[PDB]
Design a protein around this ligand. Structure first.
Ligand SMILES: CC(C)CCC[C@@H](C)[C@H]1CC[C@H]2[C@@H]3CC=C4C[C@@H](OC(=O)CCC(=O)O)CC[C@]4(C)[C@H]3CC[C@]12C
Ligand SMILES: CC(C)CCC[C@@H](C)[C@H]1CC[C@H]2[C@@H]3CC=C4C[C@@H](OC(=O)CCC(=O)O)CC[C@]4(C)[C@H]3CC[C@]12C
Lengths: 60, 60
């Protein structure tokens, strides 16, 4: 399923930029857990990982 | 009205992400107060709550 992964990765990175739509989830079973996982992914990427990068510069 | 709440919550969280549109307000009376409330919600979520999280890491 290399092609599916290749397409989805571009879509996921675009969603990470803040632009796009998660229309691909129609084929997924148990959509709730996918929503939760994407929620936590966004939270980690934006709140914790990005903030720590901010903090490091200030202290150095 | 559990179903309406379930749908609206997803829409509201999506708006919190910065993507989506607030098309659901057509059925609402006194739209102005709804606009104001969403304004203050966004202000608190982005300006004050998010900033305090930034500040805490720097001081620790
Ligand atoms: C966060 C940092 C540390 C990681 C760097 C991110 C890259 C690994 C991501 C960002 C955008 C991604 C790319 C988005 C689009 C494509 C084209 C894709 O091949 C295609 O041309 C089919 C899809 C298309 O044509 O758009 C193969 C993966 C690639 C290079 C993706 C692979 C991984 C990339 C470079
Ligand atoms: C800011 C932090 C501390 C709170 C965490 C946010 C979650 C409580 C929000 C974010 C996205 C929300 C979800 C968006 C979509 C859905 C599916 C929804 O049920 C449906 O499948 C119908 C709507 C649809 O299929 O899209 C029930 C609520 C849920 C899990 C929402 C409930 C609450 C969630 C998980």
């Amino acid at each position: 399923d290399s092609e599916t992964f290749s397409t989805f990765l571009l879509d996921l990175f675009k969603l990470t930029i803040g632009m796009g739509d998660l229309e691909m989830l129609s084929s997924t079973k148990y959509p709730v857990v996918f929503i939760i996982l994407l929620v936590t992914y966004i939270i980690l990427t934006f709140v914790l990982l990005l903030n720590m990068l901010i903090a490091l510069m200030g202290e150095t």
